[PDB]
Amino acid sequence: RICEVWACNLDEEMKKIRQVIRKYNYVAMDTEFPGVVARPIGEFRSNADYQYQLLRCNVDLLKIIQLGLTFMNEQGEYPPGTSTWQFNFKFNLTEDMYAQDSIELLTTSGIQFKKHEEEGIETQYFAELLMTSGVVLCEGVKWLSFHSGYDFGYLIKILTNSNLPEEELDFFEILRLFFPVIYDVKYLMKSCKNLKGGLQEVAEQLELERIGPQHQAGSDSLLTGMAFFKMREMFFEDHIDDAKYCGHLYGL
Amino acid sequence: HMQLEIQVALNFIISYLYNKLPRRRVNIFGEELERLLKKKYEGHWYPEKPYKGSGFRCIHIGEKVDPVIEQASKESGLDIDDVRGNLPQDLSVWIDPFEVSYQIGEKGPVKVLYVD
Secondary structure, three states: OEEEEOHHHHHHHHHHHHHHHHHOOEEEEEEEOOOOOOOOOOOOOOHHHHHHHHHHHHHOOOOOOEEEEEEEOOOOOOOOOOOEEEEEEOOOOOOOOOOHHHHHHHHHHOOOHHHHHHHOEOHHHHHHHHHOOOOOOOOOOEEEEOOOHHHHHHHHHHHHOOOOOOOHHHHHHHHHHHOOOEEEHHHHHHHOOOOOOOHHHHHHHHOOOOOOOOOOHHHHHHHHHHHHHHHHHHOOOOOOOHHHHOOEOOOO | OOHHHHHHHHHHHHHHHEOOEOHHHHHHHHHHHHHHHHHHHOOOOOOOOOOOOHHHHOEEEOOOEOHHHHHHHHOOOOOHHHHHHHOOOOEEEEEEOOEEEEEEOOOOOOEEEEEO
């Protein structure tokens, strides 16, 4: 179900994804990064601006550690065989910046940093693959996520290969170009009176079948996708109002 | 039918606006909102399964304001910032069959306004 992806097999798997996404345009995703380590400097126009500047100063300094993508169709069905891909990126605990607790939490979750440091994927190359595979831009994709501000922040950083836009509004303009359609499940949960908490708590409340290392990108993306479709029929009349939910990331 | 539930929700929301904004505009806001909500909820009200369509029907007023509130607000000559300004921060109102409840703040408890 979940295909571990490293450098040695990046091209092989992206090629498959290049095809799977044609029939399974709904892709749920999650990431794993080295926590939050910095504090914003300067003035802030509002609470939204402060949250964005907080995200910016951290996204610009850290390196993504893991990306999880689960593909599904309009009816919430998975492609035959492998439905989820977990990309492991190159990270060096001796060179790279990070938050102590986050690394320890990830170690306990199963992340093998040693292998990330030796066989991890190069974001620069992954960026190019994302673009040349029709998963990232203005096509007809539906991105499903959970408490995703940082998740998309890291992706935007990779895809543009530069620091995030200084202004919050500019970041969202760019976000729209690469991910025109995004549904953040945690944001949607604010409209569901009986749903609260993080992914694991929502899975419990929705009685979803958890698959794999319950604390990694791939595993989480699976739950997100399952949560989205169930919630989309249960609390939303089979159709999410874009005016109110599309492109809105929890927190930002 | 759903009339009662909608008015419970409306009277609650409107109670914060009176004596804070022009009486006539608040009245229009109230009346227009009822109309918009009744229109929006038709075909999405299941007294058999009240939870069904809860999210679709949820009315939120926070950083982002529900379009129906913006529409009612515009059609009544009320500045959206004035409406959000006199209501509790991040107010969420659920209007379901036989049950109207709300939540002041993202972490606040869900309180019941009307139930059967």
